[PDB]
């Protein structure tokens, strides 16, 4: 994954040289920031259930047609709304992963790289996952540096979907 | 006509594929030749050679194609050419080092540049490496050589002209050339303009003839010229230094001269010391 530590390791590997003080400084910076990132991730996962359900309702309200229009892509049937909730949960799990990984690596490997193709084939309108992520961005309940870093990742996802 | 043009002897192909792929000695030669072609005859110091690649190279885990790509994408190559030059100039250098030719038309720059802009440089080198041309002329077991001199593949005539702009001699390296640090085949490539062949220096005076058509007479006479019997011969010159009234101005330039006057003009030019590059009918 595209972790800062891992990226430095790969940069040194391509040149075949032992890790110089530049890479060590970079990883030290990541360790110094990791305290805030990990506290934020713990908070988000302890409160995950509320956020996932609220986001599902948020998209059902902003786009009522999506829960009343026939089609497999729509959540009118109970199975469809369950799948919508499951996908929102995937997004939240990825945001916690990228919080603890100190970069956008996890998001890019398990999302982003591929989202366009799948959103076209399975008729998954990006707008749905834009509005849900905005709800999460507003109800995350974090404060301080945790709030800014988590919102940075969530907006990365928003700007990648659209 | 070999010595003057510069192709001293480029008359064979060095493969490494063998039962003895190492061959105990031949592999040393192949490694040297790859360094000479990919890095543009740059003098690589012993400490900064790409030892990791050579390890796999003798082991047989990687082929010559993989070795050439490894050098091309290694920072050794990037510091010399990729990072430090205009991007189009970098495209020209890639064509010279990996495919042993020069850009035949502007579409080449379009394609490679778009790769660089979106996919990244690594993908650009990938495209050169696995292009049909590299796969055919070379074979994952044959060090790239300057096949631009030979015309067998199928190419625009201009290609010959253009390759002689990039190759300015056996000794020369593209990190160190007369016109270096700026595009060498960019203005011409957009206009599909031919280039006069500038012979590399050989134990006589050299005067690299830049040919910006911004201020030169047209290739053709575009008229009757003086109107004397016979056509109009275009004479180029580079090293005009003796008659500097404000400073001569435009030391390298061409003059369209009617046939009858050529002799006189010639001696005048020789008096200034410029060695006539070419005398082409217009």
């Amino acid at each position: 994954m595209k972790t800062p530590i891992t990226e430095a390791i790969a940069a040194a590997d391509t040149q075949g040289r032992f890790l110089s003080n530049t890479e060590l400084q970079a990883v030290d910076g990541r360790f110094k920031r990791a305290v805030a990132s990990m506290e934020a991730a713990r908070a988000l996962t302890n409160n995950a259930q509320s956020l996932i359900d609220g986001a599902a309702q948020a998209v059902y309200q902003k786009f009522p047609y999506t829960t009343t229009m026939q089609g497999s892509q729509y959540a009118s049937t109970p199975e469809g709304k369950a799948k919508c909730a499951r996908d929102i949960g995937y997004y939240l799990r990825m945001v916690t992963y990228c919080l603890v990984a100190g970069g956008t690596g996890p998001m890019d490997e398990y999302l982003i790289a591929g989202l366009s193709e799948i959103n076209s084939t399975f008729d998954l309108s990006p707008s749905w996952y834009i509005e849900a992520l905005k709800y999460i961005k507003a109800n995350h309940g974090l404060t301080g540096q945790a709030a800014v870093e988590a919102n940075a990742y969530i907006d990365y996802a928003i700007n990648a979907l659209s | 006509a070999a010595s003057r043009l510069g192709t001293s002897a480029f008359s064979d192909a060095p493969p490494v594929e063998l039962r003895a792929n190492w061959s105990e000695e031949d592999l040393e030669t192949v490694i040297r030749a790859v360094y000479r072609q990919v890095l543009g005859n740059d003098y690589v110091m012993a400490s900064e050679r790409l030892v990791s690649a050579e390890s796999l190279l003798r082991n047989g885990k990687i082929t010559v194609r993989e070795f050439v790509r490894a050098v091309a994408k290694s920072e050794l190559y990037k510091e010399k050419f990729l990072y430090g030059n205009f991007q189009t100039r970098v495209i020209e250098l890639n064509y010279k080092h990996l495919l042993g030719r020069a850009p035949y038309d502007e579409s080449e720059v379009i394609f490679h540049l778009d790769l660089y802009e979106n996919e990244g440089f690594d993908a650009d080198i990938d495209s050169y490496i696995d292009s049909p041309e590299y796969t055919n002329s070379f074979g994952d077991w044959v060090v790239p050589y300057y096949r631009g001199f030979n015309t067998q593949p199928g190419q625009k005539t201009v290609g010959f002209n253009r390759i002689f702009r990039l190759y300015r001699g056996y000794a020369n390296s593209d990190r160190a050339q007369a016109e270096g640090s700026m595009s060498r085949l960019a203005r011409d490539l957009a206009t599909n303009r031919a280039n006069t062949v500038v012979p590399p220096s050989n134990s006589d005076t050299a005067f690299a003839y830049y040919t910006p058509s911004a201020d030169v007479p047209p290739r053709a006479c575009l008229g009757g010229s003086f109107g004397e019997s016979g056509r109009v011969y275009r004479i180029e010159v580079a090293g005009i230094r003796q008659p500097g009234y404000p400073g001569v101005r435009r030391s390298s330039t061409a003059f369209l001269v009617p046939y009858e006057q050529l002799s006189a003009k010639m001696q005048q030019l020789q008096r200034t010391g410029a060695r006539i590059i070419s005398v082409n009918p217009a």
């Binding site: - | 990072y83 030059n85 205009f86 991007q87 189009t88 203005r187 957009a190």
Partner: protein, 172 residues
């Protein structure tokens, strides 16, 4: 590719004398305002796409001859190339801002751009106008007095403007 620190070191190496106290103080001043430089590049990179898009629509509104048939930014392929060459300039100017030195901008983007454009026949003056549009957009976005701890950053804004101006003058 040399940043400000590397530029001073290389010049000192050409002389061959240890860095003097004055040079040390200068580099320390550069580091003292480094956080501002980092924030500026961060903000500009986050809005890069919008910067180039708004500047492009303005350029084609003020010079319609470009998008009229037979003009240089016509046929939708050349339009793509035009947007590409605006964002390229923005990217290398961002590199220059982070470095603190214009060497990258002058060596890998501006070095020969004018010749390429005039050989193409595409108007260099119009390119400069586009650069200036991007200049005002980026300078407004980066200096936006909202969201971060307030301070005096006029010097850094002047430097950013200097980079953009250098590009505009070098292309036209």
């Amino acid at each position: 590719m040399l940043d400000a620190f590397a530029k001073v070191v290389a010049q000192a190496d050409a002389r061959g004398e240890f860095l003097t106290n004055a040079q040390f103080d200068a580099l320390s001043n550069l580091v003292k305002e480094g956080n501002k430089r980092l924030d500026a590049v961060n903000r500009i990179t986050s809005n890069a796409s919008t910067i180039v898009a708004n500047a492009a629509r303005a350029l084609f509104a003020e010079q319609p001859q470009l998008i009229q048939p037979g003009g240089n930014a016509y046929t939708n392929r050349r339009m793509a190339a035009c947007l590409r060459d605006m964002e390229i300039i923005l990217r290398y100017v961002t590199y220059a801002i982070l470095a603190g030195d214009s060497s990258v901008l002058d060596d890998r983007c501006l070095n020969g751009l004018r010749e390429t454009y005039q050989a193409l026949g595409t108007p260099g003056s119009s390119v400069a106008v586009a650069i200036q549009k991007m200049k005002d957009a980026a300078i407004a976005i980066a200096n936006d007095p909202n969201g971060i701890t307030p301070g005096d950053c006029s010097a850094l804004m002047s430097e950013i403007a200097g980079y953009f101006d250098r590009a505009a003058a070098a292309v036209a």
